[PDB]
């Protein structure tokens, strides 16, 4: 599961993999270190899958 993010996402002048992070508590949350540059189709897959939220109606 979290492998494929670590996979993914990448941590960033050098770009390097990232560290694929987990949730937190301090009820819970969730929580995930990017880089600046990734790629748009790939954040909604990210999203939509690890998350797996519905759609929403207004943002």
Same mark, same amino acid.
């Given at each position: 599961?979290?492998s494929?993010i670590k #996979?993914?996402?990448k &941590? =960033?002048?050098?770009?390097?993999?990232?560290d694929?992070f %987990?949730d937190? @508590?301090? &009820?819970? %949350? &969730?929580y995930?270190?990017? @880089?600046s540059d990734? @790629?748009?189709?790939?954040?909604y897959?990210?999203?939509t #899958?690890?998350? =797996?939220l519905?759609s929403p109606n207004?943002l």
């Amino acid at each position: 599961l979290a492998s494929w993010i670590k #996979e993914n996402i990448k &941590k =960033k002048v050098r770009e390097t993999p990232t560290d694929a992070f %987990g949730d937190i @508590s301090f &009820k819970t %949350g &969730k929580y995930v270190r990017v @880089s600046s540059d990734t @790629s748009c189709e790939n954040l909604y897959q990210l999203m939509t #899958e690890q998350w =797996k939220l519905r759609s929403p109606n207004l943002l």
